[PDB]
């Protein structure tokens, strides 16, 4: 792992760690899932955490957080993720839609930070992320 991907994870973890206390409760997951158009039940949330709660303390810490991303880094599900960004369904995620989704996760992002993101997902250089390019990003 590089220095860059640690710092990425950190802010990733921090999208979830709303209250800054260094852990993600079910309530925070619930909150994020919903901001992403989802509606998970108390029980689902518990399972998510139960699946990687090594210390069995009922909440997610950083290490376990990374475990989650380790595990999911092992289709139909991809389209649904994509459709969360592709708000007008035209098949391309623009910066604006990316911005909107980030903002919707309580991110405040500079015009340029949005662009950097578009830029790192964008393979063909048309300045948007298409499904297939979205796919590569979901493959790392």
């Amino acid at each position: 792992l590089t220095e860059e991907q640690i710092a990425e994870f950190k802010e990733a973890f921090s999208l979830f760690d709303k209250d800054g206390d260094g852990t993600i409760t079910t309530k925070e997951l619930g909150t994020v899932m919903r901001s992403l158009g989802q509606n998970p039940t108390e029980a689902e949330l518990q399972d998510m955490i139960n699946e990687v709660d090594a210390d069995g303390n009922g909440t997610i810490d950083f290490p376990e957080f990374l475990t989650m991303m380790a595990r999911k880094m092992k289709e139909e599900e991809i389209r649904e993720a994509f459709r969360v960004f592709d708000k007008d369904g035209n098949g391309y995620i623009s910066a604006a839609e990316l911005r909107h989704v980030m903002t919707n996760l309580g991110e405040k992002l500079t015009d340029e930070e949005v662009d950097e993101m578009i830029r790192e997902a964008d393979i063909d250089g048309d300045g948007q992320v298409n499904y297939e390019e979205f796919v590569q990003m979901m493959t790392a």
Binding site: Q5, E8, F9, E11, A12, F13, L15, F16, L29, V32, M33, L36, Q38, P40, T41, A43, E44, D47, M48, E51, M68, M69, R71, K72, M73, E77, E80, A81, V84, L98, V101, M102, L105, E107, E113, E116, M117, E120, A121, M137, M138, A140
Partner: peptide, 21 residues
């Protein structure tokens, strides 16, 4: 940077893999 979006989706997907109809 793009890891913010990325992991957003990882836990997203991690829920999908835990739904109960």
């Amino acid at each position: 940077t793009v890891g913010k979006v990325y992991a957003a989706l990882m836990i997203f997907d991690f829920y999908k893999q835990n739904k109960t109809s």
